[PDB]
């Protein structure tokens, strides 16, 4: 369960996150494969040129120039992708779970389920003890939940954190992508034990990392666009008070009150999945149905 | 139960997509498990030639000519086929998982599945059956009232099919365009003279002859896929889908008072009647108030 | 499940297909695992010859001759087997997953399964629910017979698929027997790479020659058996009017001499289900007599 | 499953032997392509070493040539024959479950026996309803009309063991005949002189002394299998299978009115009594008219 | 189910056999990885010595001396251990399978269990449902007393299997003591390959010569312990007269001097079972006297 | 099931045994993976020395010195660790699976579990026919068990035997492990007589995985040391409380029923073991041991 509070901008984000994870794991796999750098000593019929270097001196040169000339971005790109995917997924999961605010969600889901299976909605639009108990417990839930600010402000905090993390990711990926290069000009001072001073190196997974970087940049661009749209949606209509106006006109009940804060936010969240549970809640919220039920009882 | 709303074209295209995925992954896995390019210098009884090159200079030349001589298509073909296969998969399944387009579909399928085991159909042409049938009538009436004005369950289908058609066209375009560039032996002209001593090289691409065959197979499969998509698009345009005609049904049933439904209900009725051209008649039975009149007359 | 509507051949050939697939993949296990063609230059007590070649020139020569000398059949043998096995598996399954050709299958299977367990079957030859149960199954039989007794849509596809399978069997035998003799162990390689290696003519050995030849012979045997089974089926479909069925012997045995003789698609499916168990036909024909309707209405009232 | 009751001791013994043969064959195949098969050196028809002056690929060429030009076909393709024959034994031992003729009758028989296996009427009548007992009876009477008409479910079990026995005989024949050709040191005389420089070679087959012991173990296993097959063939012949005699039941029961059946049902009774000797006694009680008449009289 | 019938030595020998299997498989899995032989030619400031041999002549020498210089015991140590361990496993739990050997044990276990908790035993030692239960107990007691008296089918097999285990012990310890000194580190390989390598005498080192040695000792030790247990079993099967049972102490303790002596298979089974628990014997003996039947008949009325 | 009958000192050792097993397998795998001894010849601007040895000469030298230069501890430490851990596990899991002394265990567990939660227990300690009948049956089961168990001494000798065996094993382990721990060193000197085969007589060798073993060795000792202490404590517990006899003193005073007897022998030892887990199961059992309870149930039957 728990999928009812999932607007269209919450499964798309999960798909984007899993795609980013796939990109990162592919990058790490390619990192572990291949021989990485390859360096040769620069000198500054067509017979070959004899460098006269042992088999271990090549390994020494390659290892020294792999951590002396390559830019720090070209060596730790998949790791950064993995870290950012991890933090995005954790931020997505942290809001809902919050070990200490989940019960308010499970009990609310149970309330929605019970109000969904009630067949009295049809009669109201135009076993009594069970309904009375349901009304009493719904009143208890209202009085218990309608007070605090714990389901709106922290959602905004999550979204703002996501947007700022995005802005930073775009910021430093845009600049540090022209430094992923194929051929580099390693220049070290190992002259008394190798014999050569200037070496030219050829990083292998350069173009592939450039393509992966472009793909990752586009995927984030879409993710940040989604999060920015959500934040703007939360900050141009002020979804803190819910006005039950159309329900009153299209239902006939004239005693429909308006709820405020967290319950209003949860109603706002629900309507994206199906704009019909508010119908059941409005029908169940009237005090005249219980009056008629007890009048019939007597 | 979603397979009912899946005509033959949308199982044939699904099998085509699966085959595309398998060929693409085969190519991708074969690419790595191979020695790739191999280059040698050019000298522009028999006795061998002494090049006097080290063991690392060979690797240097190989991995330099790999990215300085080979065409971009010959290197990233499995990746392209994987990407396009993934788009094709998440281009036809998107019309189901979009929020706001799922509740109507599940309600429709529930009503259709339920409106099959009703004795009234047999009797048309005991307390439980009457109340259950009345509940079915009320549910159908309210659902019809629901899906009558907001007609977003059909434009998405045409849009996605058009997207598939245009993607197919471009796929064919630049696969036929750049399929003759996958050659076996190539010439590499890189300027590394003070490092290795040779300026001109001749290279062989190990997987050049296999990639051509896989490209041809992919071209054939995508051509068949595009032909199916064009047929579906044509079927979606040769007569209005936002209306239905219970012409012969009313004539052969003698209940000629049922109105002709339109918009989303009509379109899904067109889609479903292809799978089984009988269910529509069942719906007719549970769209006439005359059945309710018979029920009330029998009760009263 | 969907196993009753399958004669012996349709459960025999199936095994062959999977067997074929195994051979296919088996080849693919080695075609990329074992070391491929090995080539040496040719110069046309005992002391060896110094060719004076590096270790990369050897790889160059090997993978150039591998594609400039070997026949196109010796390299792609497993892939053709895999493709043909897959397409046979597809053709044999173009029977249950084609909208417009599966509704009748499921209807008939469900009706047969529910009718075989009906008590009226054993009561005919010597309650409350059974009344309307038998009634409803009777209208279901009536509507089914009025439904699937006009067009042979589902009998015109079995013939099509079997004919295509026979044609493909012929093609496979033809071209596979044509080129089975070109898989050779030792070959000659005449490529003009002298400015880069110094040697013009090479002699090569293809590592997987005998193994491919033996696998090819096994594949030919399997395909021949497959084609013989398909030929038997084709002969089975044309030696009488398969589109008509007569309820004569059942009437003689039982005594209810009023069940009509069906034709077309339902007759075809009844023949198929008869090729598996000669008991279903009678158990269903007993629900086709007007006298049975009279007995049912007398019992109910 | 529900078909596990048709397994005498020898059938399960043969299954265990066959899985053991498969294990040996897969072990042999695993060792086949994991080592270097052959090692060949040229022959030259103070102590110092002698230099061949051969490259590192001419050794591979020589090894690969002499491996398929000097080794007997038995030493190379040994494990595959073991796998083929184990697979064929597995197939032959089960070619009477999948045939439609035998598949239907076995299922019907097991269903009838299972239905009779949970009938409290038998326990009540022996130790100390209606339609279920009555209906089960009518099935039995017609059951011994469909089954006792020909040799279908019994002819297979006698026509397959003969094939198994003959296949065992031929296996022993050409496996003992060609076990002395697995040599360790062999000679190779190939005419490759203008390419390598040496004409005569001496070769060692690394996996020679192990294939001999594997062959001996395989011969022992197949010999035990063949002894089992001969035992079951003799058991199928020393006394008639087409007839079953209800002899001891008459003395141990006293209800001397049960007739004796023949043919496929007789063979099935033979096998089931070879199984746990408790199904026959339970099933025989549904053949006496006395119990049915008593039940009818009591009910009416 | 049948574990209650297993005395201590059965589980002890089972654990020992499992340990033998463990060490054998450990030896085999160490051999598969690192087992090899290193051979060098012999020449019967400081500088190194040049042998002037390629990388293939070393492999030739190694794999020739590996089978012309190593004793067959060192080559295959763990395979024999595995074979013998499997033989011991099959020898154990052998008499449980060849005969029926399922009813004769399970029924006895069930009767002993339901005789253990019979309230009549407690009533005597200090409705109709109890009467019929006791009658059933007595009648099946007599039924098995008469039925099983046919020979020795659950007794001779035990002696046969113990004897076979003892003989396996004797032979195994014999030839493992005989050959344990044939495993060495350094060996001399005198093979005649002179025109192909140039060297006639070689000295070779075996990798796991000091390992297979130590393991062997451990293995031997385990076997030794095994044998002792088996010997004890033979002492138990040879000293006590298991073919007859004598109900002596019950007569003096209870005073009801009418219980007859049981013999043969039931005597042996009681001798075996009383080891697990010396209380089931008296519970079984209670239901063997005619006075108990007389009391049962009197109470039934 | 087998949880209540396990004091804390029998679960601390359970954790320690698995810790030792994992350390041993870690050592074994790190041994099988990495390279063994590496040896070089000795010569008993700078320029390198050319030994002039082939690639198989070096393998021969390494393989011979690995066995002619290394002390047997540095060679086979981890298998000793594994053997001793397995022996400890066998010792600790002995009396649960020894025929002739295991049936009593589940009999006692079942009886105690049955009488732990019964309405009659609550009713009797406060001051239907089915409940009375089941209580009566449980009374007979307890009465027969008392005579079934309260006569032998087999479940007490085995416990002390296994504990003393574990203690002596711990002593031996610490003894020789401490003795042979300074012989696991890094650089060793190899002196083999091969002059006609390789050309060099004296070699110097380095054992690759030496220091690591030493580290592991110390860890092992610590665990064993702790293990020993635990065993010692248990060995002290058995020999100072007089575990043979059990007194129902506290139960009588806090319940008032002055007819519960003092049990001895095997049953007393089992009660001593169980009350070390939670000291109220004894009360629930003692409820089902009073003739007063039998008389009360007999009266309530009427």
């Amino acid at each position: 369960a728990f999928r009812v509070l999932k607007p269209w901008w919450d499964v798309f984000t999960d798909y984007l996150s899993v795609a980013m994870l796939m990109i990162g794991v592919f990058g790490c796999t390619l990192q572990v494969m291949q021989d990485k750098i390859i360096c040769l000593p620069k000198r500054v019929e067509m017979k070959g040129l004899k460098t006269d270097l042992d088999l271990q001196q090549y390994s020494f040169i390659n290892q020294m120039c792999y951590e002396r000339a390559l830019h720090w971005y070209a060596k730790y790109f998949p790791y950064l992708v993995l870290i950012h995917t991890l933090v995005f997924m954790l931020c997505s999961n942290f809001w809902f779970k919050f070990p200490g605010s989940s019960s308010k969600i499970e009990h609310f889901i149970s309330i929605l389920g019970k109000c969904f299976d009630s067949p009295w909605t049809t009669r109201a639009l135009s076993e009594g003890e069970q309904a009375k108990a349901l009304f009493e417990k719904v009143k208890k839930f209202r009085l218990h939940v309608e007070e605090g600010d714990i389901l709106y402000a922290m959602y905004v905090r999550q979204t703002v954190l996501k947007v700022i993390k995005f802005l930073i990711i775009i910021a430093y990926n845009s600049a540090l992508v022209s430094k992923v290069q194929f051929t580099v000009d390693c220049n070290v001072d190992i002259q008394d034990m190798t014999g050569y001073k200037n070496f030219s190196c050829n990083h292998t997974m350069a173009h592939l990392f450039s393509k992966l970087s472009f793909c990752y940049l586009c995927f984030v661009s879409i993710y940040g666009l989604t999060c920015l749209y959500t934040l703007y949606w939360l900050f141009y209509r002020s979804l803190r008070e819910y006005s039950f106006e159309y329900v009153r006109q299209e239902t006939g009940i004239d005693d429909i009150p308006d709820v405020k804060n967290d319950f209003a936010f949860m109603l706002h969240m629900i309507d994206q999945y199906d704009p019909l549970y508010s119908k059941r809640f409005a029908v169940f919220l009237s005090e005249v149905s219980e009056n008629k039920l007890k009048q019939l009882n007597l």
Side-chain angles (χ1 to χ4, degrees), chain A:
Chain A
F2 323 111
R3 55 181 41 90
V4 65
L5 296 172
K6 281 317 189 75
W8 71 267
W9 61 78
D10 198 287
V11 291
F12 185 62
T13 70
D14 178 61
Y15 279 166
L16 293 195
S17 285
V18 74
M20 293 180 183
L21 193 143
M22 182 179 72
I23 288 283
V25 74
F26 184 63
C28 290
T29 300
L30 270 293
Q31 268 284 111
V32 63
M33 311 215 178
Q34 274 82 18
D35 199 11
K36 317 165 188 212
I37 203 164
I38 286 181
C39 303
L40 276 180
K42 189 191 289 186
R43 282 138 171 281
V44 173
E45 288 201 301
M46 272 196 308
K47 296 329 298 172
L49 181 62
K50 304 188 64 39
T51 48
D52 283 322
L53 290 188
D54 288 89
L55 188 152
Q56 200 193 17
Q57 301 184 58
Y58 291 166
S59 289
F60 188 73
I61 294 162
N62 291 357
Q63 185 196 85
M64 210 191 185
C65 282
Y66 175 83
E67 299 191 359
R68 190 68 61 192
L70 290 179
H71 199 254
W72 72 266
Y73 190 68
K75 312 189 291 207
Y76 307 124
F77 171 92
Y79 306 157
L80 292 185
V81 175
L82 265 293
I83 296 313
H84 284 337
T85 300
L86 179 77
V87 67
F88 275 130
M89 271 193 176
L90 174 147
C91 281
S92 163
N93 192 295
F94 157 75
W95 170 89
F96 164 91
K97 208 262 185 178
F98 200 68
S101 293
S102 195
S103 61
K104 277 195 251 193
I105 303 174
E106 195 279 307
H107 173 197
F108 182 76
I109 291 299
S110 68
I111 284 175
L112 282 187
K114 258 161 178 175
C115 82
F116 180 73
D117 281 327
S118 167
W120 292 353
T121 58
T122 313
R123 303 211 68 243
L125 285 171
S126 311
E127 77 288 341
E129 62 88 16
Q130 314 166 329
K132 278 295 305 306
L134 188 58
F135 206 52
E136 201 46 30
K137 71 192 290 180
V138 161
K139 167 267 171 185
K140 298 294 295 302
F141 182 77
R142 292 177 68 253
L143 271 294
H144 168 39
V145 172
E146 289 173 350
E147 57 188 359
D149 285 328
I150 193 164
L151 274 297
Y152 174 83
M154 48 78 78
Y155 187 78
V156 174
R157 283 200 297 242
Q158 183 196 191
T159 46
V160 163
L161 187 153
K162 270 182 205 222
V163 170
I164 185 161
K165 190 162 295 322
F166 180 75
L167 280 150
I168 298 311
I169 284 170
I170 301 285
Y172 65 92
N173 272 321
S174 65
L176 297 192
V177 165
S178 69
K179 293 188 176 304
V180 169
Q181 204 170 1
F182 188 69
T183 291
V184 300
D185 201 278
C186 186
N187 189 353
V188 287
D189 199 74
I190 46 170
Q191 183 66 41
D192 47 359
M193 77 204 169
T194 300
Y196 298 117
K197 191 175 189 294
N198 300 311
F199 308 101
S200 177
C201 300
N202 274 353
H203 191 270
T204 75
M205 309 144 295
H207 294 172
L208 195 149
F209 276 175
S210 178
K211 311 300 164 41
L212 290 178
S213 170
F214 292 166
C215 284
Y216 176 71
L217 193 69
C218 283
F219 279 17
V220 298
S221 175
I222 299 299
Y223 197 110
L225 188 153
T226 285
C227 288
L228 186 75
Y229 156 82
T230 286
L231 259 180
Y232 194 90
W233 170 78
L234 280 183
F235 280 179
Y236 91 91
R237 65 178 65 252
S238 65
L239 284 184
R240 185 175 290 172
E241 170 73 34
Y242 196 33
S243 279
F244 274 125
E245 314 313 296
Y246 63 97
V247 300
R248 182 189 334 281
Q249 311 303 136
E250 293 177 350
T251 312
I253 305 298
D254 213 2
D255 63 278
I256 318 182
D258 289 337
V259 186
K260 179 255 163 163
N261 194 226
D262 288 349
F263 182 76
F265 165 83
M266 306 154 79
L267 293 167
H268 301 136
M269 275 309 109
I270 290 290
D271 58 50
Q272 282 85 19
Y273 194 110
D274 199 5
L276 185 146
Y277 294 74
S278 308
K279 300 289 94 175
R280 273 91 181 90
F281 192 84
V283 170
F284 181 89
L285 184 58
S286 68
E287 66 269 15
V288 296
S289 180
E290 54 171 354
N291 292 135
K292 301 319 161 196
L293 283 165
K294 61 172 67 68
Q295 182 180 2
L296 261 55
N297 185 279
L298 275 73

